[PDB]
């Protein structure tokens, strides 16, 4: 088939799920890509379908701050999704490395994140699993680009129509509406931007507990705050944005487009 003809593998970049990621090159073009190789003799009928939901969505999304999918290929034994190569590692690791970001940096990172989210939403796509692990950095340089990945959890919404699309995502990043098993829509990803922006600033999330139940109780209640001495020095504006992102009521929450106009994003 068409993949083993046109591309040529090199080093493993990642493991996780049944999915091995490896650097590759189109032998005509000379152009490097990231290839997500999925073992398929290990995978059911509907989970060949769940994976083709994923391709179909990556294809709807052309953005500077979204990992572009360049071509999906079903060979007998394996599937290859062919992504933009992005070497900067996870934002997660970069936060850990640097402990926290400057407001200047956080502002420049979340800006790119929100722009992507905005685009995702206008295309009727809700990520549902935003977190610094699903955010890849272009290079490690102290400002470089940030792109979204793992639409493996991503849903299609018709308009601002809310609905129960089920209970999925990462515990820390879950919205109050999702935990309550209420209907939900685009805003569940601005909650995640809340968590992420908070992390981006001070090195730890606004909600945590080793006992999962206590965690889900913290989220529902919207029980975060700004501990001293770290938040003592952080602009009232920054806090404000986080407060409008971590609003419990989805309707009263800030939207991606709103968040991009907020003073801590556009100054001068």
């Amino acid at each position: 088939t068409r993949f083993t003809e046109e591309y040529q593998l090199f080093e493993e970049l990642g493991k996780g799920a049944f999915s091995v990621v490896r650097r590759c090159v189109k032998v005509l073009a000379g152009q490097e890509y990231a290839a997500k190789i999925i073992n398929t003799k290990k995978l059911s009928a509907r989970d060949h379908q769940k994976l083709e939901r994923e391709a179909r969505i990556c294809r709807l999304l052309k953005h500077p701050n979204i990992v572009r999918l360049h071509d999906s290929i079903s060979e007998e034994g394996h599937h290859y999704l062919i992504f933009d190569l992005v070497t900067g590692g996870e934002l997660f690791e970069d936060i850990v490395a640097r402990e926290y970001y400057s407001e200047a940096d956080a502002s420049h990172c979340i800006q790119q994140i929100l722009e992507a989210v905005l685009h995702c939403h206008q295309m009727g796509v809700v990520h549902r699993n935003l977190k610094p692990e699903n955010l890849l950095l272009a290079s490690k340089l102290k400002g470089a680009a940030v792109k979204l990945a793992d639409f493996g959890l991503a849903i299609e919404v018709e308009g601002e129509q809310q609905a129960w699309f089920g209970f999925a995502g990462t515990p820390g990043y879950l919205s109050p509406e999702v935990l309550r098993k209420d209907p939900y829509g685009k805003p569940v990803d601005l909650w995640a931007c809340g968590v992420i922006l908070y992390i981006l600033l001070v090195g730890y999330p606004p909600f945590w507990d080793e006992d999962q139940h206590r965690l889900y109780k913290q989220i529902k209640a919207g029980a975060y705050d700004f501990p001293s001495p770290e938040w003592d020095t952080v602009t009232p504006e920054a806090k404000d944005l986080i407060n409008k992102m971590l609003t419990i009521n989805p309707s009263k929450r800030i939207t991606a487009a709103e968040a991009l106009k907020h003073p801590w994003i556009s100054h001068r």
Partner: peptide, 19 residues
Amino acid sequence: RTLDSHASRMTQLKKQAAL
């Protein structure tokens, strides 16, 4: 268990799986 210090809080930052 976390102290009441920035650096102790910063250990709450853990990778988390989906579901």
